[PDB]
Amino acid sequence: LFKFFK
Amino acid sequence: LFKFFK
Amino acid sequence: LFKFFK
Amino acid sequence: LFKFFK
Amino acid sequence: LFKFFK
Amino acid sequence: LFKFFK
Amino acid sequence: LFKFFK
Amino acid sequence: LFKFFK
Amino acid sequence: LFKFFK
Amino acid sequence: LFKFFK
Amino acid sequence: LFKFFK
Amino acid sequence: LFKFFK
Amino acid sequence: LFKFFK
Amino acid sequence: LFKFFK
Amino acid sequence: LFKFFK
Amino acid sequence: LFKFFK
Amino acid sequence: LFKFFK
Amino acid sequence: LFKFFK
Amino acid sequence: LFKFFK
Amino acid sequence: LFKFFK
Amino acid sequence: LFKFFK
Amino acid sequence: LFKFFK
Amino acid sequence: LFKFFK
Amino acid sequence: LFKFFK
Amino acid sequence: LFKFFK
Amino acid sequence: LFKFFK
Amino acid sequence: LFKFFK
Amino acid sequence: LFKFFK
Amino acid sequence: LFKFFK
Amino acid sequence: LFKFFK
Amino acid sequence: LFKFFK
Amino acid sequence: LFKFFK
Amino acid sequence: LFKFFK
Amino acid sequence: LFKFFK
Amino acid sequence: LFKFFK
Amino acid sequence: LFKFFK
Ligand code: NA
Ligand code: NA
Ligand code: NA
Ligand code: NA
Ligand code: NA
Ligand code: NA
Ligand code: NA
Ligand code: NA
Ligand code: NA
Ligand code: NA
Ligand code: NA
Ligand code: NA
Ligand code: NA
Ligand code: NA
Ligand code: NA
Ligand code: NA
Ligand code: NA
Ligand code: NA
């Protein structure tokens, strides 16, 4: 599971 | 801006 | 899932 | 401006 | 889904 | 001016 | 769907 | 002037 | 659909 | 002057 | 930023 | 098991 | 940062 | 059994 | 840091 | 039996 | 550090 | 039987 | 028939 | 820039 | 028909 | 930059 | 149809 | 940088 | 379709 | 650095 | 698809 | 350093 | 998939 | 020093 | 998989 | 000095 | 597996 | 001096 | 396995 | 002086 923000 | 969850 | 804004 | 969700 | 404005 | 949703 | 004005 | 919706 | 004026 | 709708 | 659990 | 952040 | 248990 | 952190 | 029991 | 820490 | 019993 | 520490 | 460029 | 035909 | 570049 | 056709 | 680069 | 098509 | 590099 | 496609 | 290096 | 793919 | 060296 | 793969 | 030297 | 694998 | 020299 | 393996 | 000289 | 093995 992951969260990614740019 | 980008927010990506998986 | 994602949100993208430009 | 662009807002794109998928 | 998206919204685009110019 | 242009507004485009899809 | 769109609206366009010139 | 022009207004165009579709 | 459109409206055009000159 | 011209007004044209379609 | 990235947060990744597995 | 793990948590990873960047 | 990384935390890993096994 | 172990715990590892970086 | 690492803690390992066996 | 053992415990190990680094 | 290491503690080892047998 | 023994105990060992380092 | 109508052809409109702008 | 645009071309429009009806 | 409509072709719009910007 | 974009191209749009309807 | 829509092609949008940015 | 991105390319978007609909 | 969407291709996004950053 | 990343590449994202949808 | 997503490829992320850091 | 890391590589991540989804 | 994830490959992480430190 | 370490290598980690998931 | 994890390989850790210290 | 040590090597650890999981 | 663990190999520890001191 | 010692060598330890698990 | 353990080998200890002193 | 001694040697010890387990
Ligand atoms: Na999530
Ligand atoms: Na969403
Ligand atoms: Na919409
Ligand atoms: Na409309
Ligand atoms: Na009308
Ligand atoms: Na977890
Ligand atoms: Na544990
Ligand atoms: Na123990
Ligand atoms: Na004992
Ligand atoms: Na033109
Ligand atoms: Na263009
Ligand atoms: Na581009
Ligand atoms: Na890139
Ligand atoms: Na890298
Ligand atoms: Na390394
Ligand atoms: Na070593
Ligand atoms: Na030694
Ligand atoms: Na000796």
Numbering used by the authors:
A (entry chain B), B (entry chain A), C (entry chain B), D (entry chain A), E (entry chain B), F (entry chain A), ...: 1 to 6
Question: Could you pull the original sentences from the published paper?
Answer:
We found that the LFKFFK segment from PSMα3, identified as fibril-forming by computational methods and which indeed forms fibrils, shows dose-dependent antibacterial activity against Gram-positive Micrococcus luteus and Staphylococcus hominis, but is nontoxic to S. aureus, the secreting bacterium. We obtained two atomic resolution structures of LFKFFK; both revealed a departure from cross-β fibrils and atypical amyloid architectures. The second polymorph was composed of out-of-register β-sheets, meaning that unlike in canonical cross-β fibrils, β-strands are not perpendicular to the fibril axis. The second polymorph, featuring out-of-register β-sheets, shows intermediate quantitative measures of amyloid stability, consistent with the previous suggestion that this mating configuration could be associated to the transient nature of amyloid oligomers. The second polymorph of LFKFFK is composed of out-of-register β-sheets, a morphology that was also suggested to serve as a pathway to toxic amyloid aggregates, and the interface between the sheets is reminiscent of the KLVFFA segment of amyloid-β42. Thus, the two different polymorphs of the antibacterial peptide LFKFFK display features which, in human disease-associated amyloids, correlate with toxicity. We correspondingly suggest that atypical fibrils of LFKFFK encode toxicity to bacteria, while the reversible fibril formation provides means to regulate activity. By not representing a spine that recapitulates the properties of the full-length PSMα3, the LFKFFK segment exemplifies how an array of activities can be derived from a single polypeptide, through generation of shorter derivatives with different structural properties.
